[PDB]
Structure formats: structure tokens, C-alpha cells
């Protein structure tokens, strides 16, 4: 998250850190959203590689004991069957991870609430992106969970020529684009939390930014629109 501020440790308890094994250690690669005690919603591109993944729930500082973490292996990965890794602009950047164990809920570990199917936010709706991704373009990961205020940019504006043109699809949510604040690498798969009727819900799964860089004016961060995938998500959880 570029231009973010440090999240309070109990503000976004469905955020997870998706990590892969590297040697005798684990490296954060992506975010995700806990949506069931044994299911995480993340971006399909996050699990393109044939790695060993784990999820950490109740994580705040990647590199320090918080006293609240639960570490759990990924037992099954269900990528959207229409996903194509060399066409992120096609969409379908969404995947569900079944955990090897059901995690325990507490103030630090809670299910993310998802929007109702079909729901589209008004232009400039209030949202926060959260994650441990780079804090600058070609920078380094955040040690502590970051949040940045990233109002939505609706499909008409974001699919216009000045913005993303035909690269963005209506199955995506755009947010930000102010040149200062953005998602960045390592935020992929994590949530966009948008305030609706007084409740935050996860409307977006972070998918991509500009090849030019993370905080690029008129290149808002692009997210998979969760409310386009509610039936998919329910079908997968019900079948697995
Ligand atoms: Br949350
Ligand atoms: Br559950
Ligand atoms: Br699998
Ligand atoms: Br269990
Ligand atoms: Br909703
Ligand atoms: Br939307
Ligand atoms: Br829809
Ligand atoms: Br749906
Ligand atoms: Na930690
Ligand atoms: Xe990203």
C-alpha cells in the first residue's frame, strides 16, 4: 500500500497474509480475506506458481510476534475456471483457498462480509485498501498492515480512455487513482473494504496496477468485483 497509514491491529480482522515457503522460512506474497473458518478468498494470480502456501490470520507485523497469529496450511486451491494468467485484464482474478484447519475466531480473526450479488458502488464511494504490499513503487513490503483511503472510480470513468480504457471490465472495481495512494505488489488478493449502510464489506480483491507503477494518476488500483462472484464463491464452498 503506497501512501497508507498503519492499521490499528484490530481494525481489519478478516485480512490474511498469504505466504509461500522459501527454504527454511516463509515469505509474504499476497493478501486475502478470510470468508469461512476454513476458507480464504484471494486473487488467482497469487496462486499461479506451484508453491507451498500458508495463510496467517491475526497477523499485524510480518516480522514480529504479535501474540495473535494463527498459521495454517493451504490444503486445496480453487482458481476461477475462466482465469488466464497472461490476461489479467480479462478478469476472473479470484481464487478460494481451503485451509487445512479451521481457524479460531476472536477480535483479531473474523470472517469478512461480502456484498450482495450484483451490488455496484456509486462513484467515489469510501473504501480502504489494506495490505502489506510495497509502500512505494519498486519499494519494499510493509512490516505492519497498512490501510489507504481509496474512493471508488466507477466503471464509466475508469474504463474511459484517460484511465484504463478497455483494460478494465465491469467485473472489476477501480479505486484511487490520485497519484499518491494505491495498492502495490504484495497487496494482490487482499481486500477493498467499502463502507455500505454503515457496515464495511469486502467489495474488491486486489488484482492489478499500472505497469508504470503503483500510484499513477488516473490509473486507479483495480480489484476483482466480489459482488460479481457470489454464486461462484457459494458454489465452490458448497462443493468442497
Ligand atoms: Br475486516
Ligand atoms: Br464458517
Ligand atoms: Br490444490
Ligand atoms: Br480443524
Ligand atoms: Br451489499
Ligand atoms: Br463496484
Ligand atoms: Br454482477
Ligand atoms: Br454472482
Ligand atoms: Na506477526
Ligand atoms: Xe497490485
CSV table of C-alpha atoms in Angstrom, one decimal, residues 72-166:
chain,number,residue,atom,x,y,z
A,72,UNK,CA,-2.5,-22.7,8.8
A,73,UNK,CA,-1.6,-24.7,5.7
A,74,UNK,CA,-3.5,-24.4,2.4
A,75,UNK,CA,-5.0,-27.8,1.6
A,76,UNK,CA,-6.9,-27.0,-1.6
A,77,UNK,CA,-6.7,-24.2,-4.1
A,78,UNK,CA,-9.7,-23.5,-6.4
A,79,UNK,CA,-9.0,-20.9,-9.0
A,80,UNK,CA,-11.8,-19.4,-11.1
A,81,UNK,CA,-12.0,-21.8,-14.1
A,82,UNK,CA,-12.1,-18.8,-16.5
A,83,UNK,CA,-8.8,-17.3,-15.2
A,84,UNK,CA,-6.0,-16.9,-17.7
A,85,UNK,CA,-2.6,-15.9,-16.2
A,86,UNK,CA,-1.4,-13.9,-19.2
A,87,UNK,CA,-4.6,-11.9,-19.5
A,88,UNK,CA,-5.3,-10.3,-16.1
A,89,UNK,CA,-7.3,-7.7,-17.9
A,90,UNK,CA,-9.8,-10.5,-18.9
A,91,UNK,CA,-10.8,-10.7,-15.3
A,92,UNK,CA,-11.7,-13.7,-13.2
A,93,UNK,CA,-8.7,-12.9,-10.9
A,94,UNK,CA,-10.2,-14.8,-7.9
A,95,UNK,CA,-9.4,-18.0,-6.1
A,96,UNK,CA,-10.6,-19.8,-3.0
A,97,UNK,CA,-8.2,-21.5,-0.6
A,98,UNK,CA,-9.5,-24.2,1.7
A,99,UNK,CA,-7.5,-24.3,4.9
A,100,UNK,CA,-6.1,-27.4,6.4
A,101,UNK,CA,-7.6,-26.4,9.7
A,102,UNK,CA,-10.5,-24.2,10.7
A,103,UNK,CA,-9.1,-21.1,12.4
A,104,UNK,CA,-10.4,-19.8,15.7
A,105,UNK,CA,-12.3,-16.5,15.7
A,106,UNK,CA,-11.5,-13.7,18.1
A,107,UNK,CA,-11.1,-9.9,17.9
A,108,UNK,CA,-8.2,-10.5,15.5
A,109,UNK,CA,-9.7,-13.2,13.3
A,110,UNK,CA,-13.2,-12.7,11.9
A,111,UNK,CA,-15.0,-13.5,8.6
A,112,UNK,CA,-15.1,-10.8,6.0
A,113,UNK,CA,-18.5,-9.8,5.0
A,114,UNK,CA,-19.2,-9.9,1.2
A,115,UNK,CA,-21.6,-7.6,-0.6
A,116,UNK,CA,-24.8,-8.8,-2.0
A,117,UNK,CA,-24.6,-10.2,-5.5
A,118,UNK,CA,-24.7,-7.6,-8.3
A,119,UNK,CA,-24.0,-4.7,-6.0
A,120,UNK,CA,-22.2,-1.7,-7.7
A,121,UNK,CA,-20.9,1.2,-5.7
A,122,UNK,CA,-21.6,4.8,-6.5
A,123,UNK,CA,-18.7,6.7,-7.9
A,124,UNK,CA,-16.4,8.0,-5.2
A,125,UNK,CA,-17.7,5.5,-2.5
A,126,UNK,CA,-15.5,5.4,0.6
A,127,UNK,CA,-13.2,2.4,0.7
A,128,UNK,CA,-9.9,1.4,2.3
A,129,UNK,CA,-7.4,-1.0,0.8
A,130,UNK,CA,-5.4,-3.0,3.3
A,131,UNK,CA,-2.2,-4.9,3.0
A,132,UNK,CA,1.5,-5.5,3.5
A,133,UNK,CA,2.4,-4.8,-0.1
A,134,UNK,CA,5.1,-2.4,-1.3
A,135,UNK,CA,4.9,1.1,0.3
A,136,UNK,CA,6.4,2.6,-2.8
A,137,UNK,CA,6.6,1.6,-6.5
A,138,UNK,CA,9.6,-0.8,-6.7
A,139,UNK,CA,9.9,-0.4,-2.9
A,140,UNK,CA,9.6,-3.0,-0.2
A,141,UNK,CA,6.9,-4.6,1.7
A,142,UNK,CA,5.3,-3.0,4.8
A,143,UNK,CA,6.2,-4.7,8.0
A,144,UNK,CA,2.9,-3.6,9.6
A,145,UNK,CA,-0.5,-3.8,8.0
A,146,UNK,CA,-1.2,-0.6,6.0
A,147,UNK,CA,-4.5,1.0,5.0
A,148,UNK,CA,-5.2,3.6,2.5
A,149,UNK,CA,-8.3,5.5,1.7
A,150,UNK,CA,-9.2,4.8,-1.9
A,151,UNK,CA,-12.5,6.0,-3.1
A,152,UNK,CA,-14.1,4.1,-6.0
A,153,UNK,CA,-13.8,5.2,-9.5
A,154,UNK,CA,-16.9,3.9,-11.3
A,155,UNK,CA,-16.8,1.8,-14.5
A,156,UNK,CA,-17.7,4.7,-16.8
A,157,UNK,CA,-14.8,6.9,-15.6
A,158,UNK,CA,-12.3,4.0,-15.1
A,159,UNK,CA,-12.9,2.4,-18.5
A,160,UNK,CA,-12.6,5.8,-20.2
A,161,UNK,CA,-9.5,6.5,-22.4
A,162,UNK,CA,-7.7,8.7,-19.8
A,163,UNK,CA,-8.0,6.0,-17.2
A,164,UNK,CA,-7.7,2.3,-18.0
A,165,UNK,CA,-9.7,2.2,-21.3
A,166,UNK,CA,-10.8,-1.3,-22.3
